[PDB]
Design a binder for this molecule. Structure first.
Ligand SMILES: C[C@@H]1CC[C@@]2(OC1)O[C@H]1C[C@H]3[C@@H]4CC=C5C[C@@H](OCC[C@H](CO)CO[C@@H]6O[C@H](CO)[C@@H](O[C@H]7O[C@H](CO)[C@@H](O)[C@H](O)[C@H]7O)[C@H](O)[C@H]6O)CC[C@]5(C)[C@H]4CC[C@]3(C)[C@H]1[C@@H]2C
Ligand SMILES: C[C@@H]1CC[C@@]2(OC1)O[C@H]1C[C@H]3[C@@H]4CC=C5C[C@@H](OCC[C@H](CO)CO[C@@H]6O[C@H](CO)[C@@H](O[C@H]7O[C@H](CO)[C@@H](O)[C@H](O)[C@H]7O)[C@H](O)[C@H]6O)CC[C@]5(C)[C@H]4CC[C@]3(C)[C@H]1[C@@H]2C
Ligand SMILES: C[C@@H]1CC[C@@]2(OC1)O[C@H]1C[C@H]3[C@@H]4CC=C5C[C@@H](O)CC[C@]5(C)[C@H]4CC[C@]3(C)[C@H]1[C@@H]2C
Ligand SMILES: C[C@@H]1CC[C@@]2(OC1)O[C@H]1C[C@H]3[C@@H]4CC=C5C[C@@H](O)CC[C@]5(C)[C@H]4CC[C@]3(C)[C@H]1[C@@H]2C
Ligand SMILES: *[C@@H]1O[C@H](CO)[C@@H](O)[C@H](O)[C@H]1NC(C)=O
Ligand SMILES: *[C@@H]1O[C@H](CO)[C@@H](O)[C@H](O)[C@H]1NC(C)=O
Lengths: 622, 309
């Protein structure tokens, strides 16, 4: 059977129409068909499968069958194995999908697409057995194993395989498909991390010490020395020195560390403006440093907006806004900029000067917190950020327990001790603020123990109490109960809850750390991708680069590259050969397994037993 | 026989040797400043620091102890988690301290007190030092305070704290206390627990490897402890001017005997490995399967011959 001649487009649609009618794919196709009929030979048309693929991927299967709108029904498919694998995958048939993937031209991209589609359908699965099978598709495992084989083979063609534009999947980079699939374990592979590190250091050698890099950064002229080694490959000399300067200062790591240094400068300047150079309203004029800070933040917001929106040529504005607001750190950025605007506006007035100063004080905290997200890319710090983000849940559980116990104890003690205090502020104080401070060693017995209560001048009258003429006298009717309750509260809170939280953090750390490392690598990929297009000038300078970019756009990538046809075909054949070798190795290891050998031995011993029994009967006949 | 520059590099490579160099440099500087009168107090201060440096040297001295050395290695490994916690705490503390200093004392020009209220006090908040008398208006004392900057700078009266939005200051103090004194500290405890569990086994081996070198050093060390050691040094110098249990050289016959014994033991070890490989379950399964295939084909031929008769 010749699949290339067997699989025509009409035959493919015939296969798609003959779905089992009891699986998820049939329900999705029916939904699409009803939608198309409402918007208005074969039960399902290629429009329905195209829309299903649009739901599942939304960028890859564009023009797979719409290009010609349907193609010639008798014309054979250009990519038969790709279509067969896609078809077998949409209906949770994994054994067949596996066989088709073993025959496809591009296997890593196919495996990543398969795992993406499986994890997308896992949510839509109705039956628990189907969902369980879908969650164990292990198609990402196939991609990782095949890429491990490829990386062990060449380690130089593997990077080209990662960064090339696949022909079968609409010029989609393998890394792009992995990002779409959110294949975290694939990015955790050593080869992908090595490629990302190579991108990270730019022209410099990846083994360069951090101290040498920092020293060279702080003293620019040392770039032309031999302090840092570079990877190989009047007018000429000037070109050489300019090339060296650019190759050093265009490296993503240098851009990152410059951004960090200038963000530290921003925090220093913000603190100085807020603490020493905060002047009266514009009638007396905001300080020049305050204007510099305003310009600084304007440049920062410009960079944020450019990175979030102007990086992509074609995408819906509403979709881009939703994607931006999806991230929590972007919500923190929005809070920071809103606080900055409100504080500046209130500062410009005189009746709201103090409110503006307060809002700017809060904004400094927000920016200093933004610093953590800035440092997220650090090799030693990022996993810690992930771990803390996971610890937040145990923090919330402890908060629930502590809140219940604290409400109880505080309200009871406020009732027992100050039953005649009408002041709501002081009621809430003695009910919640003081018991909360009891946790941190702040136990003011002068207001709780009669033997320790001072002979201060106190009143019992409510009127005088409200006016604040004298502090309200504490009730000492049953103070033994108050002291006993304080003892029990101290025990419970300061021992049981705190040590329980310590145990919870220990367990959570042990269970989470390994996943946190993989998640850090997966996030590191995206951070390096972002640093690719980021201008090499850190803020507030970044305005020069923004103006230059705007002027160039008005007048007029190491990752995700496109290769010549000959080299592309060579790499495709090399991938196919490596896939064949990997499958042969798996099959050979299966044959030599102890269980397979036992099965073979048992079957052959049974056959030998019956045959030699016949032979012995023949011998006894003689 | 070794290059002087190479020996200097090898010496300065070790961190404890760097600590020793710091100690001796501090001793020299302190003695020099003590010899003068205008720098007497500075010399006393430098010697005070040097005492701390020597008392820290005591740990490296005790490193060879059988029960203490692995603990030294473990602490040296814990330093990294200490640094991670330091980064987190530094970021959070800078944020909270600068914000509270802005909210509470917006008119204090004194840089020393700005840095105090911004970093020293929030740092002490970790260790149960929470002076609410300067943070909560209901707890702020009726002390004699000034608002004027001039008088503030001269130190005539302490600067009055701002109480515009003190609910925000108390809320920020509550959040800072929660985060720092609970999340960061218990996270560091968990990090130390995990690091201890993962590191202890390697720390023991590293302790043994270092113990070898320490014993090698103690081999040639004179038996007289300092300050007496000068007698041994003078004796050694005089002997050098006038004129080992480990790393010994053996006679030719004994050397050849030990070489042949080593070869025999190596042959025995290799034979044991090969024998254990032959008797392994996997090798037995492979042998059985191959012999069963051969027996199958051969007995099939034999049965064909028998059926021919
Ligand atoms: C292992 C475990 C640990 C936890 C716990 O169980 C065991 O420990 C138990 C110990 C127990 C506590 C043991 C003892 C007591 C005392 C008792 O009062 C005795 C009754 C009398 C009658 O009102 C009160 O006395 C007097 O009050 C007056 C207040 O008007 C004071 O006037 C003051 O006025 C001025 C103050 O400004 C100044 O002039 C002086 O300062 C002073 O003159 C007197 O000086 C003082 O004599 C109440 C109960 C209490 C606190 C126990 C509570 C429970 C424990 C903590 C147990 C734990 C479970
Ligand atoms: C479970 C969890 C724990 C954490 C938390 O959430 C829940 O707890 C919440 C509790 C809450 C707090 C609850 C209550 C309050 C009070 C409120 O002020 C009310 C407004 C008024 C208006 O300015 C202020 O009042 C007055 O100020 C004056 C200062 O000029 C005082 O004058 C003093 O002058 C002299 C002082 O030397 C002396 O004569 C006397 O000492 C006294 O006369 C008055 O006495 C006092 O009446 C501000 C907010 C605050 C602190 C809450 C903050 C947030 C919490 C901690 C929550 C946590 C998240
Ligand atoms: C963590 C929660 C947040 C929300 C809340 O409880 C803790 O905060 C508390 C702070 C309280 C304030 C504190 C001070 C004053 C001033 C006083 O003249 C009148 C009453 C009022 C407004 C109080 C009303 C009730 C409030 C909001 C409490 C509220 C349930
Ligand atoms: C852990 C870091 C070390 C470095 C540093 O921050 C913490 O130490 C702080 C101590 C500060 C000092 C403390 C006291 C005074 C006296 C005062 O009349 C003039 C200002 C000056 C010199 C301050 C300048 C800024 C200094 C060095 C801060 C500096 C960023
Ligand atoms: C309390 O107030 C009264 C008012 O007359 C006064 O006589 C008395 O001395 C005061 N005591 C204290 C401790 O202030
Ligand atoms: C504060 O200083 C003034 C100066 O006249 C003085 O009259 C007043 O008694 C002082 N108050 C305190 C509490 O020292």
């Amino acid at each position: 059977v010749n699949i290339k001649q067997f699989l025509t487009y009409g035959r493919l649609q015939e296969l798609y129409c003959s779905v089992s009618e009891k699986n998820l794919l049939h329900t999705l196709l029916l939904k699409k068909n009803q939608e198309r009929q409402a918007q208005l030979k074969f039960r399902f048309t290629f429009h329905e499968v195209s829309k299903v693929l649009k739901d599942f991927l939304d960028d890859t299967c564009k023009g797979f069958y719409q290009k010609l709108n349907l193609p010639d029904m008798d014309r054979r498919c250009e990519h038969p194995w790709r279509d067969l694998f896609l078809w077998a995958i949409l209906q949770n048939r994994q054994e067949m999908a596996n066989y088709f993937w073993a025959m496809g031209p591009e296997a890593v991209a196919a495996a990543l697409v398969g795992c993406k589609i499986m994890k997308e359908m896992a949510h839509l699965a109705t039956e628990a057995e189907s969902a369980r099978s879908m969650k164990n598709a292990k198609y990402e495992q196939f991609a990782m194993d095949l890429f491990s084989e490829c990386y062990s083979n060449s380690e130089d063609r593997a990077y080209s395989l990662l960064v090339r534009k696949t022909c079968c999947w609409s010029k989609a980079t393998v890394l792009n498909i992995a990002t779409l699939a959110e294949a975290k374990c694939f990015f955790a592979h050593d080869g992908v991390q090595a490629l990302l590190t190579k991108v990270w250091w730019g022209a410099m050698r990846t083994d360069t010490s951090i101290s040498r890099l920092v020293l060279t950064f702080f003293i620019p002229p040392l770039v032309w020395t031999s302090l840092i080694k570079f990877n190989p490959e009047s007018a000429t000399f000037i070109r050489v020195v300019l090339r060296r300067w650019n190759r050093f200062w265009s490296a993503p790591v240098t851009v990152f560390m410059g951004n960090v240094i200038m963000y530290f400068a921003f925090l220093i300047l913000f603190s100085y403006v807020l603490l020493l150079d905060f002047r009266p309203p514009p009638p007396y004029g905001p300080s020049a440093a305050e204007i510099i800070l305003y310009f600084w933040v304007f440049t920062l917001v410009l960079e944020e907006i450019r990175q979030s929106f102007f990086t992509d040529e074609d995408m819906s504005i509403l979709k881009k806004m939703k994607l931006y607001v999806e991230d929590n750190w972007n919500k923190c950025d929005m809070v920071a900029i809103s606080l900055f605007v409100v504080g500046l506006s209130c500062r410009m007035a005189m009746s709201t000067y103090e409110a503006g100063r307060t809002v700017l004080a809060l904004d400094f905290m927000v920016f200093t917190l933004r610093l953590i997200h800035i440092f997220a890319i650090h090799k030693q710090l990022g996993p810690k950020i992930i771990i803390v983000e996971r610890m937040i849940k145990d923090v919330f559980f402890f908060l629930f327990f502590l809140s219940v116990w604290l409400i109880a104890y505080g309200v009871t003690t406020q009732a027992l001790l100050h039953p005649n205090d009408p002041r709501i502020d002081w009621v809430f104080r003695r009910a919640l603020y003081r018991p909360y401070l009891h946790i941190f060693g702040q136990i003011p017995l002068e207001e709780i123990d009669a033997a320790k209560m001072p002979d201060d001048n106190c009143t019992t009258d409510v009127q005088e109490i409200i006016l604040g003429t004298l502090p309200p006298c504490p009730n000492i009717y049953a103070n033994w109960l108050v002291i006993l309750l304080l003892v029990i509260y101290l025990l419970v809170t300061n021992v049981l809850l705190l040590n329980l939280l310590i145990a919870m953090f220990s367990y959570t750390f042990q269970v989470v750390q390994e996943n946190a490392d993989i998640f850090w690598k997966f996030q590191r990929y995206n951070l390096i991708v972002e640093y690719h297009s980021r201008p090499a000038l850190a803020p507030p300078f970044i305005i020069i680069s923004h103006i230059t970019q705007a002027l160039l756009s008005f007048i007029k990538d190491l990752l995700e590259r496109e290769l010549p046809s000959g080299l592309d075909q060579k790499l495709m054949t090399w991938e196919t050969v490596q896939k064949e070798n990997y499958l042969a190795k798996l099959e050979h290891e299966h044959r030599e397994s102890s269980g397979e050998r036992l099965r073979y031995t048992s079957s052959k011993v049974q056959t030998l037993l019956r045959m030699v029994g016949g032979f012995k009967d023949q011998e006894k006949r003689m």
